[PDB]
Subunit: 304 residues, 4 copies
């Protein structure tokens, strides 16, 4: 069952009214929910503009208190390709920065419905490419990794595919990712309602982001159907027991493993989709952040 | 775990070498495996030709020993849209006839690769339509139901969708059906190899049957994504515990239930995909046939 | 998910208030719930007294309309060893009689708390032994089988063990059985509350029936830990997807299979514990009864 | 599926021949498998003797390079209550020490069959009590936590129960623990063979350790049936996807959560029982050690 703390929270009306309110209103509600978490101190924070192929991309850079050199984690926020932003994810990105002792660059990719697929992918890739080529600006010579949650985990997985034989990504962290279209998995059906992220929400996000059903078959939306997953960066894949997206994330882990990619796939039991965003309340979220910290300290620094 | 009888069978090389031999050779191997089962006596067997929209459709009609009037079960064989035929399914159709005390009409729909999607769907629908309009020829006034296994269960489900507000199908029986494209379910991943029907086979069948990836999004291949499942006939859906297709069949059951369609969804534990075809060996297959008999005797005759 | 029909029912307060009302009151509530189902006609019904080792055992005998000779199904009602009786199970036993075309003998074994374990086992065994030795009285020469639901499925499984090398039981039907003590299975934990049979109820029944914790290790309460399951009668084991007892019933199926006993293990999806008792409402219950009919017609008559 | 690395390992004969060789030989085989892992540097290692109630208890103390004050993790090795020792666990305890920046005290509790249950429990409790009362000897004033793997996770869970209202344990880490007797869970049945720890091994260990079947009902062997789990220390519970013990560990997590105890329950996918002992090969084991590090650094130091 759910952790009673989470059941209590859900029973008290913790919702984001996706598809039942205006885009502006759902963005506002999400901002207030996510941004309420404590902002842990880091050493320095900078807002930068990355020259993308299609737009000037805003990004926020978090520097850790630890001395350099650093690795750089490119972070892609979730929010169904429609909501969220760098500022609402500030508390989480600060927590990650402190866990990993690395530089985190959180990317404000273009959002749907204003900018449909593949805009978010293009921005995410362009940002990652620029950061790779400008690691010196962050004393970030230990290299680059990519991470994201939910829709941002989709983007991270896709960026890792697109980066093959261009960038040298050291690691990919996929936090309860969406990895394509799923009308069949048990978790999707079983947890379609009542667990914060619902099937109705998923469908609504899909309707805003994608241009046509053909986009469902594009590997830049459905990395699970990419032709060749071999040679991708080692992965940490975090899933949540009561998440409709659970099974598809675990499927992607399995597909990567079958392609010879190292993967640590961990299901956090008793919790829901989005649980890292609610780390102050949900203790397991702090522990997931600590696991991310471990894997990145190892990969970048060969430190415990 | 698998029933030890089935494990023994699999360990002895029970395969159909799908995608590793010629189409002719795999058809021949399947014919010999399936047609080896005993042919139980029925009252009468007739081969007929149904005038389809695109072809003359061969069908075999089995009459039960019980006196009429009958219901008529349209049966659509499995074989990945590529292999199988009415004659290889003769033992199974005779067993079904005797279980249900009804007329069974087994349809030789056009097969891939010679005839790609949607040829099998067109033939299956045209046959069902003709049988409905000619029930009097079989003393079949108690009505029409549709059934099929695996690829034939896909076709049956699709025919039921296409028949909405045209025919009056009384029942749909989906025996370990394929219901669309699945790259994510746990059963698909977990039982991808070693359980008779493999992922490699599934992919090969898909490559022979479908014309392009767009066909994956056609509801006539993926009934699970049909816009509206309401008003379809009551269903019996049989799945197998160790079948890659298990989860998607159970998902379709759930979607039908959510649309207000009565569904009895039963997972046969300890067995594999195709188990009804191997009823002489696999006892559970006889019991699945008996369950089909029960549901059809009830729906057609209001008899136990 | 649950069949919406069942969710609707549960949401409307369908409970038996086990452990929250007097024994008399919970017995009365259960009687009214179970006995409300239609009583289908059979050919003849007789109440008999079986001379048990410890008591005169009441039993009800149902004769089918079909002509003899018959097999005889000994039926052991559920109710947690505390509630239920032959009369509350009359509708279900009539339905079974008509499905199987056999004689059904429903046994009023002694109930807890008035008669603790192993009283119910002794009565169930003594009744089965007497019926075996008196099959001629029922024109029942096709033989004897045993069946029961829940606590009655526990008793049936135990009787089959005790009958080894004494009686010639042809078949055992275990309908969502309890097979011992379970504090660990996923189904027990996941469906501990909200699905009609709850963990609190299970614990309460255990407290009334068993004399001490040592009884938990007695194979006559926990057949799953019997030393040797080989040579037992072929089994049909029905489980329910949303039943705390699901996993343990499927475990027992697996243990029997491993001991070379034929088993057809079927999970009825979308339904709860007790669903056969509520066959008029829950359609899947009618289909489970039909499956029981199939297996018994085959075993007794070699008929479809 | 299993990580291909692990499948490869298993297919190459990675076994410990529990119950198929002498106790001496199985101890020797395990020692060579476990002790082959690299011994990472720590600051200092001391062997000590703890005055237990029934024996002088050997323990090894590992000090981290980080400066004090420290927390102290009491570590209880696995090995089915029969095999393993402090020395075979040296590589793992050094890895843990470095991950957590704390003192680790690995306890050589008495082993079966020479010393049956509850000897291991008594020694483990006595050691933990002594360490609590002697934290000053290790500059360990940040407090005490308890951890163990498999049989050692059983002991850790039991020590936490016994310590209620005596010691102030800050945390309990249960690494793929055994939590009692399980003849019913799906994982126990499904992964009974072929996944390193087998049911036959489990039964053999039980036969050596326990004195009689009554011991199965003793909460000091089956903490899952303890009367009251409330007030126990916060827990990290790690399970492995392909471990027969998986479901029972997840059940214990759920029971603790229901009793208001904080629990982070994480299933490591694609891996087997014992995977932390094989961290040099199995990368996921390094990441599990990092997760342990995170939770202990937080609890002891309020550090990331
Ligand atoms: C966390 C965000 C995951 C979003 C996954 C969306 C899955 C696809 O969503 C789908 O896409 C289509 C195209 O717009 C639509 O026709 C459908 O409404 C929808 O189901
Ligand atoms: C029992 C038969 C089920 C067949 C299910 C096939 C699922 C779709 O199969 C797919 O279709 C595509 C189009 O040809 C191909 O590109 C792929 O190889 C394949 O995975
Ligand atoms: C459908 C009926 C199943 C009943 C299963 C009971 C499982 C054992 O129940 C137990 O037995 C003990 C002895 O009385 C008690 O100490 C406990 O309260 C209880 O959990
Ligand atoms: C990782 C080690 C877990 C050991 C769990 C043992 C579970 C109980 O094991 C049992 O205990 C009994 C008493 O000795 C025996 O009668 C049985 O052989 C055995 O199944």
């Amino acid at each position: 069952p759910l952790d009673p703390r989470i059941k209590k929270l859900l029973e008290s009306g913790f919702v984001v009214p996706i598809g039942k309110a205006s885009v502006d209103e759902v963005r506002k509600i999400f901002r207030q929910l996510a941004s309420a978490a404590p902002k842990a101190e880091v050493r320095k924070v900078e807002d930068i503009k990355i020259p993308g192929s299609e737009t000037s991309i805003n990004a926020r850079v978090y520097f850790p208190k630890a001395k350099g050199p650093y690795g750089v984690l490119v972070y892609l926020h979730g929010g169904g390709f429609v909501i969220g932003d760098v500022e609402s994810y500030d508390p989480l990105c600060r927590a990650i920065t402190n866990a990993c002792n690395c530089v985190v660059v959180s990317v404000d990719y273009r959002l749907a419905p204003e900018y449909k697929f593949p805009s978010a992918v293009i921005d995410s890739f362009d940002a990652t490419n620029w950061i790779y080529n400008n690691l010196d600006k962050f004393d970030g010579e230990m290299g680059i990794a990519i991470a994201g949650d939910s829709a941002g985990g989709n983007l991270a997985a896709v960026v890792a595919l697109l980066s093959k034989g261009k960038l040298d990504l050291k690691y990919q962290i996929l936090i309860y990712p969406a990895v394509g279209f799923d009308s069949v998995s048990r978790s999707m059906i079983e947890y379609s309602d009542g667990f914060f992220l619902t099937r109705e929400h998923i469908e609504w996000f899909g309707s805003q982001y994608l241009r046509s059903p053909a986009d469902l078959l594009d590997f830049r939306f459905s990395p699970i159907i990419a032709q060749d997953l071999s040679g991708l960066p080692p992965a940490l894949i975090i899933t949540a027991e009561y998440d409709p997206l659970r099974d598809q994330g675990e499927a992607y882990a399995n597909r990567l493993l079958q392609a010879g990619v190292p993967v640590t796939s961990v299901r956090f039991n008793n919790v829901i989709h989005g649980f890292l965003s609610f780390f102050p309340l949900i203790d397991q979220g702090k522990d997931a952040i600590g696991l991310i910290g471990s894997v990145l300290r190892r990969t970048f620094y060969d430190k415990s």
